[PDB]
Short mmCIF file of C-alpha atoms and ligand atoms in Angstrom, two decimals:
data_model
loop_
_atom_site.label_atom_id
_atom_site.label_comp_id
_atom_site.label_asym_id
_atom_site.label_seq_id
_atom_site.Cartn_x
_atom_site.Cartn_y
_atom_site.Cartn_z
CA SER A 11 243.78 51.25 65.83
CA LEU A 12 245.70 48.01 66.03
CA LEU A 13 244.16 46.16 63.03
CA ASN A 14 245.81 45.03 59.83
CA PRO A 15 244.98 42.26 57.32
CA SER A 16 247.52 39.78 58.84
CA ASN A 17 246.42 40.20 62.48
CA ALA A 18 242.73 40.29 61.61
CA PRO A 19 240.25 37.68 62.89
CA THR A 20 239.81 34.79 60.51
CA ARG A 21 236.58 34.83 58.54
CA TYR A 22 234.35 31.80 58.53
CA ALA A 23 234.79 31.42 54.93
CA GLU A 24 238.60 31.69 55.10
CA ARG A 25 238.79 28.70 57.54
CA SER A 26 240.42 25.45 56.25
CA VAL A 27 241.06 23.01 59.15
CA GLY A 28 238.48 20.47 60.35
CA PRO A 29 238.74 17.82 63.05
CA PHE A 30 240.51 15.20 60.90
CA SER A 31 243.04 17.64 59.55
CA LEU A 32 244.08 18.89 63.04
CA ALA A 33 244.63 15.28 64.13
CA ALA A 34 246.78 14.82 61.03
CA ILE A 35 248.85 17.95 62.07
CA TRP A 36 249.21 17.01 65.77
CA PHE A 37 250.31 13.43 64.91
CA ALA A 38 253.27 14.52 62.76
CA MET A 39 253.85 17.51 65.13
CA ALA A 40 254.40 15.14 68.10
CA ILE A 41 256.94 13.01 66.13
CA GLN A 42 260.04 14.97 66.84
CA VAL A 43 263.62 14.31 68.29
CA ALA A 44 263.15 16.09 71.62
CA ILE A 45 260.80 13.42 72.92
CA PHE A 46 263.54 10.76 72.44
CA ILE A 47 265.71 12.79 74.81
CA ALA A 48 262.91 13.34 77.40
CA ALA A 49 261.49 9.79 77.52
CA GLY A 50 265.01 8.37 77.39
CA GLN A 51 266.43 10.23 80.40
CA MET A 52 263.17 9.12 82.14
CA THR A 53 264.45 5.51 82.02
CA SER A 54 266.89 6.69 84.83
CA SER A 55 263.84 7.13 87.17
CA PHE A 56 261.30 4.69 85.99
CA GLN A 57 260.92 1.67 83.72
CA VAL A 58 259.63 2.08 80.15
CA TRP A 59 255.83 1.17 80.62
CA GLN A 60 255.57 3.73 83.39
CA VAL A 61 257.13 6.31 81.15
CA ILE A 62 254.68 5.48 78.38
CA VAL A 63 251.96 6.02 81.05
CA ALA A 64 253.57 9.28 82.05
CA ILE A 65 253.38 10.23 78.53
CA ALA A 66 249.77 9.24 78.02
CA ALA A 67 248.88 11.10 81.20
CA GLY A 68 250.69 14.26 80.33
CA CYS A 69 249.30 14.08 76.91
CA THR A 70 245.75 13.95 78.35
CA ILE A 71 246.14 16.89 80.72
CA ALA A 72 247.42 18.89 77.75
CA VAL A 73 244.20 18.12 75.77
CA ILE A 74 242.04 18.89 78.70
CA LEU A 75 243.85 22.24 78.71
CA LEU A 76 243.40 22.55 74.95
CA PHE A 77 239.61 22.13 75.18
CA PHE A 78 239.51 25.39 77.01
CA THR A 79 242.41 27.46 75.53
CA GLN A 80 241.17 26.72 71.96
CA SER A 81 237.60 27.71 72.26
CA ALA A 82 237.94 31.47 71.62
CA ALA A 83 240.24 31.07 68.60
CA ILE A 84 237.98 28.48 66.98
CA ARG A 85 234.84 30.61 67.42
CA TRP A 86 236.28 34.04 66.87
CA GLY A 87 239.34 33.38 64.64
CA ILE A 88 241.71 35.44 66.73
CA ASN A 89 245.48 35.40 67.58
CA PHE A 90 247.09 34.39 70.86
CA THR A 91 248.88 37.65 70.98
CA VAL A 92 245.61 39.53 70.37
CA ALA A 93 243.74 37.26 72.87
CA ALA A 94 246.06 38.12 75.76
CA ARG A 95 245.03 41.78 75.44
CA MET A 96 241.81 40.93 77.37
CA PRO A 97 242.93 40.16 80.99
CA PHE A 98 246.32 41.85 80.80
CA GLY A 99 246.48 45.29 79.23
CA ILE A 100 246.54 46.07 75.47
CA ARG A 101 250.23 46.60 76.10
CA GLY A 102 250.55 44.92 79.47
CA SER A 103 249.80 41.56 77.65
CA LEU A 104 253.19 42.11 75.87
CA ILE A 105 254.94 41.17 79.14
CA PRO A 106 253.78 37.46 79.48
CA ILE A 107 253.66 37.29 75.59
CA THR A 108 257.34 38.28 75.51
CA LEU A 109 258.03 35.55 77.91
CA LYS A 110 256.22 33.21 75.70
CA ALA A 111 257.45 34.46 72.31
CA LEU A 112 260.94 34.00 73.67
CA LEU A 113 260.26 30.40 74.84
CA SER A 114 258.65 29.61 71.37
CA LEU A 115 261.76 31.19 69.76
CA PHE A 116 264.08 29.13 71.97
CA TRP A 117 262.47 25.91 70.63
CA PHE A 118 262.80 27.08 67.03
CA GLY A 119 266.60 27.55 67.06
CA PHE A 120 266.90 24.23 68.91
CA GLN A 121 265.04 22.08 66.39
CA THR A 122 266.59 23.91 63.40
CA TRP A 123 269.86 22.82 64.94
CA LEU A 124 268.75 19.23 65.11
CA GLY A 125 267.44 19.55 61.55
CA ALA A 126 270.77 21.08 60.29
CA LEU A 127 272.63 18.28 62.04
CA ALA A 128 270.62 15.88 59.99
CA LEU A 129 271.11 17.44 56.60
CA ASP A 130 274.87 17.82 57.35
CA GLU A 131 274.97 14.18 58.28
CA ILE A 132 273.39 13.24 54.81
CA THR A 133 275.87 15.33 52.92
CA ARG A 134 278.96 14.23 54.80
CA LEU A 135 277.79 10.63 54.29
CA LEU A 136 278.15 11.53 50.58
CA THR A 137 280.89 14.05 50.26
CA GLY A 138 282.73 14.14 53.65
CA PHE A 139 282.13 17.88 53.77
CA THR A 140 280.84 18.70 57.32
CA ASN A 141 280.03 22.41 57.58
CA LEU A 142 277.05 22.76 60.15
CA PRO A 143 276.45 26.47 60.37
CA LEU A 144 275.83 26.86 56.67
CA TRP A 145 273.38 23.96 56.88
CA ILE A 146 271.84 25.70 59.92
CA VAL A 147 271.12 28.92 57.94
CA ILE A 148 270.00 27.13 54.82
CA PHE A 149 267.46 25.16 56.91
CA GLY A 150 266.22 28.13 58.98
CA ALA A 151 265.77 29.72 55.65
CA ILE A 152 263.93 26.82 54.09
CA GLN A 153 261.53 26.73 56.96
CA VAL A 154 260.89 30.43 56.58
CA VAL A 155 259.97 30.08 52.93
CA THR A 156 257.75 27.07 53.62
CA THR A 157 256.29 29.01 56.56
CA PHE A 158 255.42 31.89 54.12
CA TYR A 159 252.60 29.60 52.88
CA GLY A 160 251.28 29.54 56.41
CA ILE A 161 248.94 26.84 57.53
CA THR A 162 248.36 25.83 53.86
CA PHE A 163 251.88 24.26 53.62
CA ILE A 164 251.75 23.00 57.15
CA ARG A 165 248.53 21.08 56.59
CA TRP A 166 249.64 19.46 53.30
CA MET A 167 253.11 18.54 54.56
CA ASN A 168 251.81 17.00 57.71
CA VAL A 169 249.18 14.68 56.11
CA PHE A 170 251.70 13.12 53.78
CA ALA A 171 254.46 13.00 56.39
CA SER A 172 252.19 11.45 59.01
CA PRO A 173 251.88 7.89 57.66
CA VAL A 174 255.48 7.89 56.41
CA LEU A 175 256.65 9.08 59.84
CA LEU A 176 254.20 6.50 61.44
CA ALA A 177 255.77 3.79 59.24
CA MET A 178 259.37 4.73 59.69
CA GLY A 179 258.78 4.57 63.37
CA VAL A 180 256.89 1.29 63.56
CA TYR A 181 259.79 -0.15 61.41
CA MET A 182 262.27 1.26 63.86
CA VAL A 183 260.81 -0.85 66.82
CA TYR A 184 261.05 -4.01 64.67
CA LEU A 185 264.77 -3.49 63.73
CA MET A 186 265.75 -2.97 67.38
CA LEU A 187 263.73 -5.83 68.98
CA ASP A 188 264.71 -8.27 66.24
CA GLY A 189 268.48 -7.38 66.11
CA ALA A 190 268.57 -7.57 69.80
CA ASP A 191 266.50 -10.75 69.92
CA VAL A 192 264.00 -9.29 72.39
CA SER A 193 260.25 -9.29 72.73
CA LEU A 194 258.17 -6.08 73.30
CA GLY A 195 257.09 -7.13 76.70
CA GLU A 196 260.58 -7.67 77.95
CA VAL A 197 261.82 -4.18 76.99
CA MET A 198 258.71 -2.79 78.69
CA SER A 199 260.26 -3.19 82.14
CA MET A 200 263.97 -2.81 81.60
CA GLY A 201 264.41 0.72 83.08
CA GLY A 202 264.20 2.53 86.35
CA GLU A 203 267.31 1.54 88.22
CA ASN A 204 267.82 4.90 89.95
CA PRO A 205 264.48 5.97 91.51
CA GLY A 206 263.89 9.30 93.27
CA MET A 207 261.70 11.33 90.97
CA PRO A 208 258.01 11.30 91.84
CA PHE A 209 255.61 9.94 89.19
CA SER A 210 253.56 13.10 89.39
CA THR A 211 256.60 15.32 88.26
CA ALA A 212 257.07 12.82 85.42
CA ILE A 213 253.50 13.59 84.09
CA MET A 214 254.36 17.24 84.75
CA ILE A 215 257.42 16.98 82.44
CA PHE A 216 255.47 15.84 79.35
CA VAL A 217 252.87 18.48 80.22
CA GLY A 218 255.65 21.06 80.53
CA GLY A 219 256.78 19.91 77.06
CA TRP A 220 253.75 21.06 75.16
CA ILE A 221 252.77 23.96 77.57
CA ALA A 222 253.91 26.63 75.15
CA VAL A 223 251.92 25.13 72.25
CA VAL A 224 248.76 24.56 74.30
CA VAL A 225 248.69 28.02 75.85
CA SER A 226 249.00 29.56 72.50
CA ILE A 227 247.16 27.10 70.26
CA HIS A 228 245.17 30.08 69.00
CA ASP A 229 247.59 30.63 66.17
CA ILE A 230 246.69 27.28 64.76
CA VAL A 231 243.09 26.88 65.61
CA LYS A 232 241.88 30.25 64.49
CA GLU A 233 242.07 28.45 61.15
CA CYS A 234 239.71 25.64 62.25
CA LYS A 235 236.28 25.04 60.73
CA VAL A 236 233.35 26.33 62.71
CA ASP A 237 229.61 26.59 62.30
CA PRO A 238 228.51 30.10 63.46
CA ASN A 239 224.98 29.00 63.94
CA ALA A 240 225.49 26.27 66.42
CA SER A 241 224.30 26.54 69.99
CA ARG A 242 225.85 26.14 73.50
CA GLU A 243 225.61 22.46 73.20
CA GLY A 244 226.65 22.30 69.59
CA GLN A 245 229.62 24.62 70.19
CA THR A 246 230.59 22.30 73.08
CA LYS A 247 230.56 19.14 71.04
CA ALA A 248 232.55 20.99 68.51
CA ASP A 249 235.09 21.96 71.04
CA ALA A 250 235.07 18.41 72.34
CA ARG A 251 235.40 16.99 68.83
CA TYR A 252 238.46 19.15 68.15
CA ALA A 253 239.96 18.36 71.61
CA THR A 254 239.34 14.66 70.93
CA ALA A 255 240.99 15.05 67.56
CA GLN A 256 244.10 16.51 69.22
CA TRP A 257 244.01 13.71 71.74
CA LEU A 258 244.12 11.09 68.96
CA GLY A 259 246.84 13.04 67.24
CA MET A 260 249.44 13.64 69.97
CA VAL A 261 248.94 10.49 72.15
CA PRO A 262 249.47 7.53 69.74
CA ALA A 263 252.30 9.49 68.01
CA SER A 264 254.28 10.51 71.10
CA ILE A 265 253.77 7.07 72.74
CA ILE A 266 255.38 5.20 69.81
CA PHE A 267 258.36 7.52 69.55
CA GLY A 268 258.63 8.18 73.32
CA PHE A 269 258.96 4.42 73.55
CA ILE A 270 261.70 4.45 70.98
CA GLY A 271 263.68 7.02 72.92
CA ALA A 272 263.27 4.98 76.12
CA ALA A 273 264.19 1.76 74.33
CA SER A 274 267.21 3.23 72.90
CA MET A 275 268.33 4.40 76.47
CA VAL A 276 267.58 1.06 78.12
CA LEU A 277 269.12 -1.23 75.38
CA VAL A 278 272.33 0.63 74.67
CA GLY A 279 272.58 3.61 77.00
CA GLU A 280 271.73 6.36 74.48
CA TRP A 281 268.44 8.09 73.76
CA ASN A 282 269.50 8.61 70.17
CA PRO A 283 268.17 5.66 67.87
CA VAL A 284 270.94 6.28 65.24
CA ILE A 285 273.43 5.00 67.74
CA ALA A 286 271.15 2.42 69.31
CA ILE A 287 270.15 0.83 65.97
CA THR A 288 273.73 1.08 64.52
CA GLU A 289 275.27 -0.83 67.35
CA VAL A 290 272.62 -3.48 67.91
CA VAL A 291 272.83 -4.35 64.20
CA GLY A 292 276.47 -3.75 63.93
CA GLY A 293 276.65 -0.92 61.42
CA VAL A 294 274.21 -0.10 58.57
CA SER A 295 274.53 0.73 54.82
CA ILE A 296 275.00 4.32 53.66
CA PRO A 297 271.46 4.38 52.16
CA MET A 298 269.86 3.09 55.40
CA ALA A 299 271.84 5.73 57.24
CA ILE A 300 270.83 8.57 54.90
CA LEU A 301 267.31 7.24 55.46
CA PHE A 302 267.43 7.87 59.32
CA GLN A 303 268.57 11.41 58.62
CA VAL A 304 265.81 11.92 56.09
CA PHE A 305 263.54 10.76 58.96
CA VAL A 306 265.07 13.40 61.38
CA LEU A 307 264.55 16.12 58.73
CA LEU A 308 260.93 14.88 58.03
CA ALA A 309 260.29 14.83 61.79
CA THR A 310 261.61 18.38 62.30
CA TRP A 311 259.78 19.88 59.47
CA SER A 312 256.45 18.68 60.76
CA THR A 313 256.90 20.30 64.11
CA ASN A 314 259.18 23.31 64.08
CA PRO A 315 257.30 25.76 61.80
CA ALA A 316 253.78 25.09 63.09
CA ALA A 317 254.74 24.81 66.83
CA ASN A 318 257.49 27.35 67.20
CA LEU A 319 257.57 29.98 64.48
CA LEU A 320 253.89 30.84 63.83
CA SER A 321 253.33 32.34 67.27
CA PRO A 322 256.24 34.88 67.39
CA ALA A 323 255.37 35.81 63.79
CA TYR A 324 251.88 36.77 64.79
CA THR A 325 253.23 38.59 67.84
CA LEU A 326 255.23 40.96 65.68
CA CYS A 327 252.70 41.72 62.97
CA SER A 328 250.04 42.36 65.62
CA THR A 329 251.91 44.49 67.95
CA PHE A 330 253.62 46.55 65.20
CA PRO A 331 250.92 46.28 62.58
CA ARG A 332 252.30 48.82 60.14
CA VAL A 333 255.88 47.74 60.62
CA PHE A 334 255.51 43.94 60.18
CA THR A 335 253.45 41.51 58.21
CA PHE A 336 253.04 37.82 58.84
CA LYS A 337 255.68 36.91 56.19
CA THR A 338 258.04 39.60 57.50
CA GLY A 339 257.52 38.51 61.15
CA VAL A 340 258.54 35.00 60.12
CA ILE A 341 261.75 36.41 58.68
CA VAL A 342 262.44 38.40 61.81
CA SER A 343 261.50 35.49 64.14
CA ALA A 344 263.74 33.00 62.40
CA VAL A 345 266.64 35.32 62.53
CA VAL A 346 266.32 36.31 66.21
CA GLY A 347 265.54 32.66 66.80
CA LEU A 348 268.87 31.41 65.41
CA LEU A 349 270.66 34.32 67.05
CA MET A 350 269.61 33.03 70.49
CA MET A 351 272.01 30.12 69.79
CA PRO A 352 269.85 27.81 71.99
CA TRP A 353 272.08 24.76 71.19
CA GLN A 354 274.37 26.02 74.07
CA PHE A 355 271.66 25.83 76.76
CA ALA A 356 273.22 23.98 79.65
CA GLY A 357 271.32 21.20 81.56
CA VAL A 358 268.77 18.77 80.48
CA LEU A 359 265.29 19.19 79.02
CA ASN A 360 263.22 17.55 81.81
CA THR A 361 264.16 20.21 84.32
CA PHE A 362 263.67 22.80 81.60
CA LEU A 363 260.25 21.36 80.84
CA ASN A 364 259.68 21.56 84.60
CA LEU A 365 260.59 25.15 84.29
CA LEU A 366 258.25 25.74 81.35
CA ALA A 367 255.15 24.27 83.12
CA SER A 368 255.33 26.29 86.34
CA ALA A 369 256.14 29.32 84.28
CA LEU A 370 253.06 29.37 82.10
CA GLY A 371 250.60 27.59 84.38
CA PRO A 372 249.10 30.80 85.70
CA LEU A 373 249.05 32.29 82.20
CA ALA A 374 246.79 29.36 80.92
CA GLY A 375 244.76 29.69 84.13
CA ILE A 376 244.10 33.52 83.74
CA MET A 377 243.12 33.14 80.07
CA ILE A 378 240.68 30.36 80.66
CA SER A 379 239.17 32.22 83.61
CA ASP A 380 238.84 35.75 82.03
CA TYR A 381 237.09 34.36 78.94
CA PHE A 382 234.98 31.53 80.44
CA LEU A 383 234.20 32.69 83.93
CA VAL A 384 234.53 36.48 84.24
CA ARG A 385 233.16 37.45 80.80
CA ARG A 386 231.14 34.34 80.01
CA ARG A 387 232.46 34.03 76.41
CA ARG A 388 231.09 37.48 75.75
CA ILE A 389 233.80 39.44 74.02
CA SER A 390 234.31 42.53 71.89
CA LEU A 391 236.50 42.11 68.87
CA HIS A 392 236.20 45.87 68.16
CA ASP A 393 238.05 46.88 71.36
CA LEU A 394 240.82 44.27 70.74
CA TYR A 395 242.05 46.19 67.73
CA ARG A 396 242.00 49.73 69.22
CA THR A 397 244.49 51.46 71.61
CA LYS A 398 241.71 52.83 73.81
CA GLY A 399 238.71 50.80 74.87
CA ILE A 400 237.46 48.42 77.55
CA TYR A 401 240.68 46.38 77.29
CA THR A 402 242.96 49.41 77.85
CA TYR A 403 242.61 49.44 81.72
CA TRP A 404 245.31 51.71 83.30
CA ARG A 405 246.88 53.46 80.27
CA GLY A 406 247.35 50.14 78.47
CA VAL A 407 248.28 47.79 81.25
CA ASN A 408 246.20 45.86 83.73
CA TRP A 409 248.47 45.81 86.74
CA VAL A 410 246.02 43.74 88.86
CA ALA A 411 246.35 40.88 86.38
CA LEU A 412 250.11 41.08 86.42
CA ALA A 413 249.68 40.91 90.27
CA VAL A 414 247.53 37.74 90.10
CA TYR A 415 250.33 36.12 87.97
CA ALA A 416 252.96 36.95 90.56
CA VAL A 417 250.85 35.73 93.48
CA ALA A 418 249.92 32.50 91.74
CA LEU A 419 253.49 31.99 90.71
CA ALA A 420 254.49 32.32 94.38
CA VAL A 421 251.90 29.82 95.79
CA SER A 422 253.13 27.60 92.95
CA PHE A 423 256.49 27.22 94.81
CA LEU A 424 254.68 25.85 97.79
CA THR A 425 254.06 22.60 95.84
CA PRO A 426 257.33 22.10 93.70
CA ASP A 427 256.19 18.77 92.26
CA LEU A 428 252.76 19.99 91.17
CA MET A 429 253.75 23.63 90.63
CA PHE A 430 251.83 23.94 87.40
CA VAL A 431 248.51 22.57 88.49
CA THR A 432 248.50 24.59 91.65
CA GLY A 433 249.64 27.72 89.80
CA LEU A 434 246.90 27.23 87.15
CA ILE A 435 244.23 26.60 89.79
CA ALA A 436 245.46 29.52 91.86
CA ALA A 437 245.56 31.92 88.99
CA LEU A 438 242.21 30.72 87.69
CA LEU A 439 240.45 31.25 91.04
CA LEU A 440 242.11 34.52 92.03
CA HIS A 441 241.35 36.11 88.64
CA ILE A 442 237.65 36.00 89.68
CA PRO A 443 237.86 38.30 92.72
CA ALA A 444 240.58 40.45 91.14
CA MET A 445 238.40 40.88 88.07
CA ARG A 446 235.27 41.49 90.17
CA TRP A 447 237.30 44.38 91.61
CA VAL A 448 238.69 45.88 88.36
CA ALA A 449 235.11 45.74 87.15
CA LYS A 450 234.22 48.47 89.56
CA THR A 451 236.56 50.91 87.84
CA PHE A 452 236.43 49.53 84.25
CA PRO A 453 233.73 47.93 82.21
CA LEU A 454 233.74 44.27 81.40
CA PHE A 455 231.51 44.66 78.25
CA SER A 456 231.14 47.11 75.40
CA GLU A 457 228.30 48.24 72.98
CA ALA A 458 230.69 47.66 70.06
CA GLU A 459 230.67 43.97 70.72
CA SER A 460 227.73 43.86 68.33
CA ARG A 461 230.14 44.54 65.41
CA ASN A 462 231.72 41.19 66.21
CA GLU A 463 230.13 39.47 63.25
CA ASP A 464 231.29 42.33 60.92
CA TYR A 465 234.80 40.97 61.39
CA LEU A 466 233.68 37.45 60.39
O1 LIG B 1 256.48 24.04 73.03
C1 LIG B 1 257.33 23.38 72.48
N1 LIG B 1 258.10 23.63 71.30
C2 LIG B 1 259.03 22.60 70.99
O2 LIG B 1 259.76 22.48 70.03
C3 LIG B 1 258.83 21.64 72.14
C4 LIG B 1 258.52 20.25 71.52
C5 LIG B 1 258.49 19.24 72.64
C6 LIG B 1 259.60 18.71 73.09
C7 LIG B 1 259.58 17.66 74.17
C8 LIG B 1 258.36 17.34 74.70
C9 LIG B 1 257.06 17.93 74.22
C10 LIG B 1 257.14 18.83 73.17
N2 LIG B 1 257.86 22.11 73.01
NA1 LIG B 2 257.27 16.68 63.37
#
């Protein structure tokens, strides 16, 4: 048996996140430093308005993906890590999941670093003392302790941060434009003096940014509010209402701040607004500096925990259920996380994000396909928490599913600038015959699936 109270499905009565709250999480979750860098470097290949469009487009494909990847977690309250057990093995799932938990972990140490940088700047602008590693640990630690309160903290922290973050950001645009004596429309076309990159791969970069979060949203949305007595059409509007809520959360947020990163680049040559606003205005008071850094901290806290730490946590406590608990998995994830020292990763993010998309495209494709197409939303919670059942396949691993991943990954390379969308579509479609083959040896359904409601 693989069940324990932390890795258990989330009961209808235990659910706490409705459609408005999820938007309020995504809005503050999109406001984070790394989009300054991405949208900034984009000004090299396109002008600002197109970048904004590449952002809105990439945001929209992500949501279209969310509509599908979130449906099982909302309805059934389950983990990502647990949900992967279906197409891949009960253990075989650990392979892509280790890929993904690593990715997730990489991002956690990166933003903790940016967060640490901020707190260290606030202090050295008050005391000249400038030790970063201590402030690294202390922040990593602070996130852990606030992450202990799981989605309860996350949800309260993001609703109050959201408008403040929204205001600090709208303010930021005024200060630049004013102090540079430039209208909004003028800045909207100042970029793109070094073309070469296709516009499709641009969209693919902002998609590749949130690919990890979207593919494992489960860990957030298994907490969302559901009415068990809906219907096909009421379940679908529910899915759509949530997907819509995620759209209105991540788009307007990441457009305003994407624009700020781009504007910084194009006005002053740096994606970082600290520099861009400092120059344009010719220095700023110690208060108004400390402020900016309070922003960065506020912008990191609303994203890092929820997006980067939740999912490896649940991976530990659900694979080693008697060894780890949620709270302990959080401690182990944040330690490993920082010990990956990701702040030394050579290159730029864009290409990394281009890496991330074509690396998880088939994963999202195989999960959407197994649940929606092969099984028709008809799943067995019972077997997901047991070493030997209809999801065990060949001694815990479904090699055919690991094969479809490879094959789809290959075909993906045949279309480098659209890798992700070909790899998803390839994995999606191939899972169908592959699964109609495995179904001749192993069963796709189980009697125990009638105990589903016992869990809820
Ligand atoms: O999946 C993740 N986790 C992260 O921290 C980053 C956040 C991000 C950076 C740049 C563009 C979109 C999302 N992406
Ligand atoms: Na944030």
